[PDB]
Ligand binder design. Sequence first.
Ligand code: SF4
Ligand code: SF4
Ligand code: ZN
Lengths: 176, 208, 29, 96, 125, 115, 379, 97, 112, 48
Amino acid sequence: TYKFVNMREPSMDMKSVTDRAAQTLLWTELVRGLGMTLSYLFREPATINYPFEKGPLSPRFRGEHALRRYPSGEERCIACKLCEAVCPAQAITIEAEPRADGSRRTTRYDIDMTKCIYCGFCQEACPVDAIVEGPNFEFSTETHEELLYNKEKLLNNGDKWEAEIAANIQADYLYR
Amino acid sequence: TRPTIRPRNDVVHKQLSAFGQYVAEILPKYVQQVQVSCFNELEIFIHPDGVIPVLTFLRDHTNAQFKSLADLTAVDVPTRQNRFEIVYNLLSLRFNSRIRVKTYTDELTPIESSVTVYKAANWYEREIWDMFGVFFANHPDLRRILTDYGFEGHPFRKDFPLSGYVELRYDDEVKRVVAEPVELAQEFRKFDLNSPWEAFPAYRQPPE
Amino acid sequence: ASKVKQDMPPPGGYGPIDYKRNLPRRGLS
Amino acid sequence: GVRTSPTGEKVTHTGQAYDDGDYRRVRFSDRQKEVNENFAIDLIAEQPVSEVGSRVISCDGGGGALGHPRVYINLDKETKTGTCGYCGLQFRQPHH
Amino acid sequence: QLIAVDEKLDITTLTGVPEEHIKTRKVRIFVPARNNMQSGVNNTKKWKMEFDTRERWENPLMGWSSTADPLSNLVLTFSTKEDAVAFAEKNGWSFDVEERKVPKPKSKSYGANFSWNKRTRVSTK
Amino acid sequence: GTSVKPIFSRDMNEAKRRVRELYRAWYREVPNTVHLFQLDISVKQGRDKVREMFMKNAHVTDPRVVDLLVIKGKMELEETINVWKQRTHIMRFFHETEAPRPTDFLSKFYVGHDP
Amino acid sequence: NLTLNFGPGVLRLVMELSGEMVRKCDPHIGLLHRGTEKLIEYKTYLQALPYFDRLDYVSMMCNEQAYSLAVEKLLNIQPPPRAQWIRVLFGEITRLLNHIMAVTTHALDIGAMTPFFWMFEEREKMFEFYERVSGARMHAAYIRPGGVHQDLPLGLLDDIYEFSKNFSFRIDELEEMLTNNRIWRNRTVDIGVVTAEDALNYGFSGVMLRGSGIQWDLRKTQPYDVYDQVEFDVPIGSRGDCYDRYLCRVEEMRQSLRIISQCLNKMPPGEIKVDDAKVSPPKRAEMKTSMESLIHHFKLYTEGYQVPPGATYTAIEAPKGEFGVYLVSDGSSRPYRCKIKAPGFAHLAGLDKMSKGHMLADVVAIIGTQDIVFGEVDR
Amino acid sequence: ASATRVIQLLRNWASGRDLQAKLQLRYQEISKRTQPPPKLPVGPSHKLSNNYYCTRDGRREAMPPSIVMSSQKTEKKAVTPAPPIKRWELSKDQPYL
Amino acid sequence: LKKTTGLVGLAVCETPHERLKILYTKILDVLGQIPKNAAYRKYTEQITNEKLGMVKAEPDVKKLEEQLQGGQIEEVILQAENELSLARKMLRWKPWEPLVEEPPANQWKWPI
Amino acid sequence: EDNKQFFGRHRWVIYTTEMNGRDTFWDVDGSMVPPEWHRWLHCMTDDP
Ligand code: SF4
Ligand code: SF4
Ligand SMILES: [Zn+2]
């Protein structure tokens, strides 16, 4: 099924021609557009008062990365390198070795935030919910160097944001 | 074939096989092979000399009328004596059908330009020349279209490295943008992902 | 015990959704 | 359990610290060195050993689907305790 | 309509490769050896062309691995050794070719596990 | 044997004639390029660079390669004449920022592992 | 007969003009050439999916859908019904987003600039829909070659219904500002007229065909997913100029509202990715309880699934025209070749013939009516 | 919307329609930001028996393309690639705009 | 008679039966010069004779449009002219002759 | 909070005049919100 968008022929009756002439000479449709703009002037604007008001977000939102840990304080990451393998931008660099207690842990976990595309593939590849994408998005920087995160920065981000991260994961994990 | 398997269409398969045999019968001077894939796509493998005739036929014959050129591109296969294969995708609106025409060339053999058959080919051919180094004869204006001015090489070739050979920066001594040999602070990490234990027995090659 | 629960349309569907062009004629010859 | 270098820098949980002759220390002048204060090895060392009356125990890290993959740990050796390969929690049979 | 020229193919001047990445490199043409950690042989079927390893150093910031040679990740696949030799020759690269290693056929007999008088008799199974 | 399809030239002489035509065109254009881009080089060294770039390919004995090179050089000349290039593209032929590389065995020994 | 170089989304235009008329107009492109097709050969199929978000970055999920359909055809599998309905619903939402952007940017370049704000409020609401379903506002990566990544949250359909039932009035305000305005008509009528045969031979598609009267639409002639289960009309032009194409785009916005209503009412229950763990990853609980699920998760996220060897050309009716992919698989987990066909490529190639014998101020209108985004043109 | 009666009448008359009926700002009619947990059913391959993977393996059912007319190895009516497309119908909902 | 075929640039043809007859007779005349054994000649002759009989057995234009399966007799005339041009060019090309040459041994072998 | 305001303007924060070490009478920014109130303020949840 199809429709014609512009296939109407104007009436030739004196009345139709006079109406078209009145439109041409008196600018009726221009006045109609002016009235539309006038009506729009008198309705409440859609502006919010940033930063005192914020934009609504979802528990699924992808923001700044963080490394998490178990309630005992032991870190969840066991250096499987699945996030490094899946990263489309090759933004994760991992080095691991046995710990002093024989535990399988990382000695290097770097994320280059200027290569990252914030796709969230790493957190869905993780088998132990170690690397996550947090809710924070206000982390602009004055230099390029501070956007190259090492393991200490990501652990500090986890310790900073764990409350919100845990609440969001509780809200959304039944869809995963 | 339960709900996870793609359903198959035998009527379209038969129709495309019949049209392939029809085309091969009509143009035996240029057609070397005809194929219909399991997802009902018909491709015709031709000799390079028949690019202009075959295409013209498929555009102008009353039983084909493939009036639309959907895409024209090239594929680089270094292991073949003729390195590059040229792929034409054609759409027929009268018969609601699609067809594919393949031919081949190497780094030094020109291919006839098809701008006289399809006006759309022009830029496509430029792109091919830009990315693979295939020259098209009788092209109205063949030149680079995607790469930077004065760029050396053809980046879509398999032996071309991913990051190229030069990188750009701003120099304050000469007060301009300059090109230098590429140096990466982090080398791209090459992954060996292919597993042993072949996946598909239906595509096994003879052990020669 | 628990039954399947996912995002679904309400029973009876949704109300009609207007899409046709509506540019009224104000009216004066 | 953070330590300090003989120079004055903090030592990370990976044991990193620039030596005295390293020029790279200059990156921290007028700035700071980011170090996480909570060492995971010390924190997991403080957990009590759980006592179970079975030869085989299962661990998933707590929280069900929010933990780690479920693994089974053998507790036949009385010399040592069974340790989870993901969580670090320890289990033992009630000796004596 | 045909030149009928008789000369070896050389497309070196057309590929845009810098001069010192042509006559200085050494390519290796070989069938890759089977990974000894596994038994599958599907990765020992095709011929590979790979370039010589160059210097890798440590990035002073972040300690990453840095390289300066653009061909460090370039690996080409070929059906036969002759195809790889032809490609390397027309591209002006000096090459070393290694012949394909094939597991020799072995005589296997389960009955030899339980031998009357030979040393092949097993002590456990 | 080994019959091949021509690009433009049936033999070496036609290819040489096309090469000479392209060289004449570049030689004529060089002063206009120097003036119009406001370059800091002289016409003499511009023409020397043109000659050097021509001599870089002087070892080719295949007419198809030769006239493909001529097609590429004509493309480059068309880019230069129409001022599609900028001053940076023109100046890239001279590598004025790249540090000199010693060809001596001892110097390459001293700097690193690269032969 | 002078020459002008209108250089720096970003486009360089070299034109010869004699007086006010345009004698020749050659676009120079490549200012956004990123080498996407070469980069894709170094990725698994899942790793390559997010590049299609960035190809035509006004219609993300449509490119996602085209790539997913190509990979599905090569894999010989099919998505579950609910995934198909979700795909078509979000494809129509994406068509609404793209058409808003195209029309309001056209008007802003002409000089109107008020409907841009009026409709970008609605665009922000649909960005909210994107974020609630995927966590990202534009580069979503939601539609996968096995279906969709996640099911919808429990209250999303209600909010989509609430939004879609007020959008027709916003379209009506747009038309009140533009449709019958004599200045807009004088800027658009009889500008960039292209005939049907020339449009066919030049490789045009979508509106650039339908404005000239060609009755063609890929969702009607070669339906994919559940499209053959929804009814809608195809707007068709009569004069093949910018004004008819603008009218067609507004009508397609209305028809997208119609299709969205149907999709909302017939959303079925069930799973959202294919129940084949060698292609689609298992659930997290299954991954954390079952041995096969853990193995398949590990292998799918490290190596990726292998695709049987073969080549396909898969095309969809994207909001800007026929968007296609020629995908060549050699049997491994990485594509051997991926050629992206973008309609804006052919449209910009035809810009030269479309602007013959027009004013300099008409080239802007022709560019706006061609609906050009250079991410897909340059790739 | 907290607009006075006079302002509502003025904006309605200038716009030419009733604006309070269809407001572009959202209010309590949107869904709550906290929702009950979902249950999320399983797919058709979740059976405990009669569920062998070889009977539901899509990738292994793909085959190399069928070769017709290899050049290396009757009335005869003419054919077309597919039957001719049928004419579209003219929208017995709104044929003209 | 109708106006505005609906495609931009496609004019309405008055008296299309005579135009169709002339075009089909020209196509048959050109096909006559092609060798009898050529598949193109016999196939196109079959198609053209079918259409010529169809237009000679129907005076009405709408019923002819329905019966010819092309619709919009103007584009049928356009297709007839395209077929005539192809017939002349194909007489020039002579593609009924055997294959020019075979491809190399593994030119079309995929994968690798 | 004010639920009679439209969505997006129904919740807001008045920042403190002095955070950890700096005067924030004039210099405020969105990163001064702690994560729990950050969750409430961005409407990721309905519960403060
Ligand atoms: S979000 Fe995506 S790009 Fe960023 S680190 Fe994770 S996987 Fe890599
Ligand atoms: S963050 Fe997760 S996926 Fe990445 S290495 Fe650690 S455990 Fe593996
Ligand atoms: Zn544990």
